[PDB]
Amino acid sequence: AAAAQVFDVGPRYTNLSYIGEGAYGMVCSAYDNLNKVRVAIKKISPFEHQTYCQRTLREIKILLRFRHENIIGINDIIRAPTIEQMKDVYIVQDLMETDLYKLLKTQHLSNDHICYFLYQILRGLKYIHSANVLHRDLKPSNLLLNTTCDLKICDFGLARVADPDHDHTGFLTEYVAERWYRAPEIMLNSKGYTKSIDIWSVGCILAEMLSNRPIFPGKHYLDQLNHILGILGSPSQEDLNCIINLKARNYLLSLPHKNKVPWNRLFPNADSKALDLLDKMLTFNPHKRIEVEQALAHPYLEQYYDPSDEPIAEAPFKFDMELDDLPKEKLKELIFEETARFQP
Numbered sequence: 001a002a003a004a005q006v007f008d009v010g011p012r013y014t015n016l017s018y019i020g021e022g023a024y025g026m027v028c029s030a031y032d033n034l035n036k037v038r039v040a041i042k043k044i045s046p047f048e049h050q051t052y053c054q055r056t057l058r059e060i061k062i063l064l065r066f067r068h069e070n071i072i073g074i075n076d077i078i079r080a081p082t083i084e085q086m087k088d089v090y091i092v093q094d095l096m097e098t099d100l101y102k103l104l105k106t107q108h109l110s111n112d113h114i115c116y117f118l119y120q121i122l123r124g125l126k127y128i129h130s131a132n133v134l135h136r137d138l139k140p141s142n143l144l145l146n147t148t149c150d151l152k153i154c155d156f157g158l159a160r161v162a163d164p165d166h167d168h169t170g171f172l173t174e175y176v177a178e179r180w181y182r183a184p185e186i187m188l189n190s191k192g193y194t195k196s197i198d199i200w201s202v203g204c205i206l207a208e209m210l211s212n213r214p215i216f217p218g219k220h221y222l223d224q225l226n227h228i229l230g231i232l233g234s235p236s237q238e239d240l241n242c243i244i245n246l247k248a249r250n251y252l253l254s255l256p257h258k259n260k261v262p263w264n265r266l267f268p269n270a271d272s273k274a275l276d277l278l279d280k281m282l283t284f285n286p287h288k289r290i291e292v293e294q295a296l297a298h299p300y301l302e303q304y305y306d307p308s309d310e311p312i313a314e315a316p317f318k319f320d321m322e323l324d325d326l327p328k329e330k331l332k333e334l335i336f337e338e339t340a341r342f343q344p
């Protein structure tokens, strides 16, 4: 077994090079001795933990169903031929040279790159939302790029089927997705079961592409709201009237008045069309927040916008995957069945 621990991707995939740690394993580039191209392989070792099996199954089911230029595909899956022998799963993907997080740490983006990246993020997100799926973890590290600036959305581990009828919850309800890209309603009254939570995350990414730093870098759950409201200012009476939960409403009413900080103050060299779209994506009230199809049609993106070339999903997910309380053993059996089509 080739080692890097065991990275047992058989004879086909050779010349392994450690390109990071992952969720439930490590990631390597490798030479595909068949297709004579380098590839990424993610070793996943999740069968110990019911949570790890849930995220692994959800991610495999979604990425096998999706087919889109701006969403990472699965080219291959390597696992043992029997459930008993299966400890690790290896997911083979196109090799991408970098990610937007690594890029923002090191590179000034031109207005043309910001425009093109945002276009490709929304084009992929249109397809995801069209499939009745919410990503729920959009952040720079989950946007891969290659040397010609092609962008692919990855990491569907926290993705869910949209369920707006069941989105409402209490104040300060605990959440999983990265704090800095969390929509204000998450801290207030939302489980994050609506498409508007992804649009908030995209708006945070846009702001981060304009400055190379996170726009709302909260140090904890409730500091996150301090940050958002320091820029958007105090929510309007109308926007408060949409929050019926007394704990969330009275919290907001307890805060001192703050006027909006205008985007042109924060980003004085930004394209004014970019700031108009940013404003529409970072709307406090999720009911007023721009939707993915309206974002694509915004004047900022007019050099790229072509809805005939922005495909939607053939086969939407109609109901959620009832993985909530399956024994890890049933989830290992579902992962086994979902990966069967790659077996010789």
Ligand SMILES: Nc1ncnc2c1ncn2[C@@H]1O[C@H](COP(=O)(O)OP(=O)(O)NP(=O)(O)O)[C@@H](O)[C@H]1O
Pocket: 019, 020, 021, 022, 023, 024, 027, 040, 042, 072, 093, 094, 095, 096, 097, 098, 099, 141, 142, 144, 154, 155
């Ligand atoms: N197809 C790919 N090509 C190249 N690098 C990749 C690829 N997929 C993931 N990576 C790298 O592996 C890590 C990201 O893994 P990803 O598939 O986004 O899931 P994750 O569980 O979010 N991983 P991470 O948070 O980075 O530890 C980062 O080091 C990426 O830059």
